[PDB]
Amino acid sequence: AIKKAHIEKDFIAFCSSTPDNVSWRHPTMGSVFIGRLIEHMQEYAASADVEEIFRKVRFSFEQPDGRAQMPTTERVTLTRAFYLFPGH
């Protein structure tokens, strides 16, 4: 049996195009991009899909005050909505 299948499908890239250079004060400090991502991944995992979670990360970075960050979601090839389902 044979069936057609897309070569590139079910992809989602979430990358920060904005620079994230190391600070002079607190050199061992964690990344603001990585940190904010995890914070949203913990609270909104059992309520929203990953594509919608990335939007919440973008919405939180709407007003610049500390590090200027604005990540872009690229090559979205997800046909459906991907819910993580914590503990399932």
């Binding site: 299948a5 897309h6 070569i7 590139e8 499908k9 079910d10 992809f11 989602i12 890239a13 979430f14 990358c15 920060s16 195009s17 904005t18 620079p19 994230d20 250079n21 190391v22 607190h26 050199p27 061992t28 400090m29 964690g30 990344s31 991009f33 990585i34 940190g35 991502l37 995890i38 991944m41 913990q42 995992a45 899909d49 990953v50 610049p64 200027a68 604005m70 090559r75 997800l78 459906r80 909505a81 991907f82 819910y83 993580l84 389902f85 914590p86 503990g87 399932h88």
Partner: protein, 147 residues
Amino acid sequence: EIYPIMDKSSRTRLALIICNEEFDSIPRRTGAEVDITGMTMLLQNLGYSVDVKKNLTASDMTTELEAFAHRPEHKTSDSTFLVFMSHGIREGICGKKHSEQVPDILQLNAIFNMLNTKNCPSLKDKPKVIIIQAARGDSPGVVWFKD
């Protein structure tokens, strides 16, 4: 209209984190250990088995990603996570032996061509999340305006 999740009792979720902090010419990425610890703990709590790779060249990143695609764990999995953490330029992710004279870049297009259906049939119809961290050589993405 939601991606079908696999039963927790019999699934083998797998994730890969490739981080570069120590370099030969380009500046050190200090505080990257906190980013590794944070992401690994997160993904493991989500059910993913995390493989962490430290300080690799573009040639080493290609082989490691090619080996990750042919893992038998993806056959009994429902999703995957890919995390890239290094310096970034116009092309993509920088390697450990990357310099101004001698370039060592892992192209972003190669990552998608690695986990695609043709080269990775095990992750067909399965969500593939690729989180990249690339600090580019352009002044902070902010512009002032009169209001």
